[PDB]
Amino acid sequence: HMLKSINHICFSVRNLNDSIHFYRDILLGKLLLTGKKTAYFELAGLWIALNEEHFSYTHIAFTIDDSEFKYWHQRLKDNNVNILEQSIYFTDPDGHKLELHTGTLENRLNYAKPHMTFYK
Q: Which residues are annotated as a binding site for Mg(2+)?
A: 8, 59, 99
List Cα–Cα distances, 93 to 20, 77, 80, 98, 101, in angstroms. 10, 14, 10, 11, 20
Active site residue 42: no
Report angle CA 68, 71, 72 to the nearest 5 degrees: 90
Say whether residue 84 binds its own copies (CB under 8 A): no
Say whether residue 64 binds its own copies (CB under 8 A): yes
Say whether residue 32 binds its own copies (CB under 8 A): yes
* 30: helix, strand or coil: strand
Cα separation of 38 and 33, whole Å? 8
Say whether residue 92 binds its own copies (CB under 8 A): no
Say whether residue 117 binds its own copies (CB under 8 A): yes
The residues of the shown chain that bind its own copies, judged by CB under 8 A, are 1-12, 27-36, 38, 40, 42-47, 49, 53-54, 56-65, 68, 71, 94, 96, 99-101, 104-106, 108-109, 113, 115-120
Which residues participate in catalysis according to the annotation? Answer: 99
